[PDB]
DNA sequence: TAACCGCGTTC
DNA sequence: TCTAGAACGCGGTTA
């Protein structure tokens, strides 16, 4: 009977919408049609589609499912329109010769909730002979609304459950319509996604609502201009503690409406009225802020709600507003007897996010986490503003925010508006164009397009294609509760992913010679391949004819000469070329090249239409054999287990009464212990080579969806490379032009990077839980192929140069300056073709060794005729040459360090900085600052020994800081440097049984500040390591730095018990710090970045105060 | 020592 | 309910 609540919400939403200018519009009647050819003559209204929501409508007894669509018109007004559409799923049969039987069974069995029945045909990619036109026969079950559809699923669950079970026991001497139901299908499609897909409607497009439906107005090009408001709030706060919406009250609310700034103040907390002021952190971001000082907090909550009602925003944007700002304003509204939904139409949703019917809530944080590609350390509003808006916003320590309401109130106003300027323009520059454009192709509304996982976005895109090609959707994948290998229970199953190598360490610089030993057979091969490789660079890499180039031979001769010189002088000590090569969209292009897609992976049971590809399976299993497993369970059955507290009338249940999941949880725990006793090992690992069949004839709907999105991405990655090149030839004097070029660059890279995460997710999606297109084989094939390609490239670079570091699809290397480099073909059109020889020599080899010659495509669909061709879309790309590269080395002999290095441009600026602490969220501030100081110094010096000598100067300076027990440092700089901040992904309660510095810090912080400091997840534990108790585990000597900001009685009490020293009177933070700990951690960074690499390049220890690992001293001593 | 865990990276 | 993947570094505990 839940329809009541739903039908109620519909009326509430209807009146809220009408208050905000969204009245239900019904188009005039029209007999005939010009069928979208002359829309101007069909009566109705034109609007820009800005939102959509599933609703329930009435006849105008049960509700009628429909979708509301919210439009902005061309006359400055708004309106909504409603489409009704019967929900439906399918029933499949195990014998299509009796489909009519099931029809009469379900017609009567589901008669309580069924509206209509119908037999339809779709294409099943899991059905034999489906490539010849055979189709699966199905019964389409339609309903008046989604509640009825659900009742049908409930009534149908037994039939499917019993049929999977065996038959009952009647006349054992004897030797049906229910068992004809094999499965239900397409039952879990969100209703509004279903309407968007079946009706081809998309938010962000222009339509004309007519009686015969929405007609797309392909003439309108640009988006409408929705009213857009972004807001932030500031609240009071107990010292060292978190805001409490039950106690703490809202001090101010700053916001921005279409570029106008406003600030509301609670004068009961703000010491004085605020005057209108301007914060324009850069000319591109204006900000004139009008003030609304109000008497009490309630007055502030009521002006905000009224201002919102007046301006009518169809977009409201925040930064983490879903889990801080909105629930604060909501609780403060409740306390003061105010109802947020009746005032502004906003309320929490089933996930606790704050949503509205007429207005999308665009929480910019969600874009940052999903689409920005920023490291976690740079995902705060400050770091984002620096990266994406190009300026430093106002920063105020939060402990100073409550008092500065009284002492320095205008300052606290400026910070408040600073967060509002940054949020508004972050939205309009980055989030608004991306999300509203993405809605034009993905069938979600703006709120869901912003928030859903990128694997789900992929699934949305894939479902559109499958529907439009009349392909029946597979049900969501479900992996089994137990898997077995060679009789062992498996703990983990996966494939071998990317191939990573650390090959050299140390400093490499464009002005410092290096020794190269060049393989003469390599130059022989390159010389043999050269005429065709250059023909490949022209014809394939540049889509042009060799007949229209006019300097082919001159380039062939010039390249050949340098090659022949390298073959005669194999040994050389020259200046290096620090180059990088990476395959563009490697896994997508491997997939599209090999025509990889989950429906294409066949067993011997079905199906040269077949291309065999190899992958590497890796399993992790217990060493226990099934004999031991069966024993462990039986024991568990004889034991007794507690019960869920429904009633607690029965307070014990047997093992076999536990859910199958909870059963194996106990089996798993018990089995780990048995293996540790009888085997002394818990998990065993094994890799197996596997070969899968990839049909090259399968319906390529998945492969083609990937191609489309890759090409969609390539647009922006190419505009990015264009505008980057423009900025190369803008006169340094022309500031405005250079500023505009850079702005274009940062936008297009952001757009290409946001498309990147969806693109790569088309690969991850085949391994995602709940995937409608799951295939481990396809993922494992993708990876092994990529490992084979990059290792082929490494083999060649090895023989003509020195590869430095290698990761999945990319190689950093140095090559002799004398190696053939960059050339420019010339055409009769006067145009030039770029050529980088090191890129093309690889690409000609990739296309020689990894092209799919068995690619097949339907040429004549009516007669089912296929035409085979060759396909290869895999290409390395080149960037460089660079001024410097710095690769660290491990403290452990023979090992490398992967995924960490610094790279510098010729202009001296940082090109890349991968992996290091400096960039990761948290870590120990000292190591962060030391790293930031050291990397630029590697460019100084005139020789390899002087470069290291210069860096060494910075080290010994940093060492003096800690050898002096922090005496050379003021207190402010001391707390910052020696602190370490770590994050707790869950709450402390869920870490029970584990020891960590974050765990210890959380516990101590809870005892001192109360339990309410642990209640939530994501807690930031800021600690220092104390000297005492001496020789104790570091996890036991971890003090939260908040104690040092507490009252002396508190400080001594906790510091005494934390150090196990009840005589402690001396609370100076300097005396508590375990300086030998930090001295060793700083020293450990120094070895890996400076001293041990220097040794590997034959340079005596530049920092003698950091002693070499014993193994190195021995090797040094030969 | 080697296995193993939580976090946050590079792909 | 909703949910892209594997390989790796590093401080830290534990067999
Ligand atoms: O977030 C990510 C990044 C990378 N990857 C995986 O790493 C592979 C190589 O990582 P890359 O960063 O090189 O990505 P890419 O080749 O797809 O894109 P561009 O170089 O053109 O910028 C990708 O093909 C993908 O499979 C992910 O799965 N997820
Ligand atoms: Ca790249
Ligand atoms: Ca790549």
Residue numbers in the entry: 31 to 90, 111 to 225, 234 to 665, 676 to 1186
What do the study's own words say?
The Saccharomyces cerevisiae B-family replicative DNA polymerases, namely Pol ϵ, Pol δ and Pol α, have been estimated to incorporate about 13 000 NTPs during each cell cycle of the yeast genome, and Pol ϵ seems to incorporate the majority of NTPs, roughly four times as many ribonucleotides as Pol δ. Other examples where an amino acid adjacent to the steric gate residue influences ribonucleotide discrimination are found among B-family polymerases. It was first shown in the ϕ29 DNA polymerase that B-family polymerases have a conserved tyrosine (Y645 in Pol ϵ) that functions as a steric gate. Our data show that Pol ϵ discriminates NTPs through the concerted action of a steric gate residue (Y645) and a sensor in the finger domain (N828). A comparison with other B-family DNA polymerases showed that both Y645 and N828 are structurally conserved residues, thus reinforcing their functional importance.
To test the hypothesis that steric hindrance does not allow the finger domain to adopt a completely closed conformation when a ribonucleotide is bound to the active site, we replaced N828 with a valine, which is both less bulky and unable to form a hydrogen bond with the β-phosphate of the incoming nucleotide. The N828VPol2CORE-UTP structure showed a ribonucleotide bound to the active site in the presence of the steric gate, Y645 and showed that M644 provides stability to the active site in wild-type Pol ϵ. Compared to both the wild-type Pol2CORE-dATP and N828VPol2CORE-dATP structures, the presence of a ribonucleotide in the N828VPol2CORE structure did not induce any significant structural changes to the residues surrounding the ribonucleotide. The 2′-OH group of the sugar was lifted slightly upwards and away from the Y645 plane, but without affecting the finger domain as V828 remained unchanged in its position. A comparison between N828VPol2CORE-UTP and M644GPol2CORE-UTP showed that the less bulky V828 could accept a ribonucleotide in the active site without introducing any strain in the finger domain or tilting of the base in the ribonucleotide. In contrast, N828 shifted position and introduced a strain in the finger helix that might promote the opening of the finger domain followed by the dissociation of the ribonucleotide before a new bond is formed in the chemical step. When replacing N828 with a valine, a ribonucleotide is accepted by the active site. Despite an upward shift in the position of the sugar moiety, there is no clash between the V828 and the 2′-C of the ribose that would induce a strain in the finger domain. Thus, the finger domain is likely to be maintained in a closed state increasing the probability that chemistry will occur with a ribonucleotide in the active site.
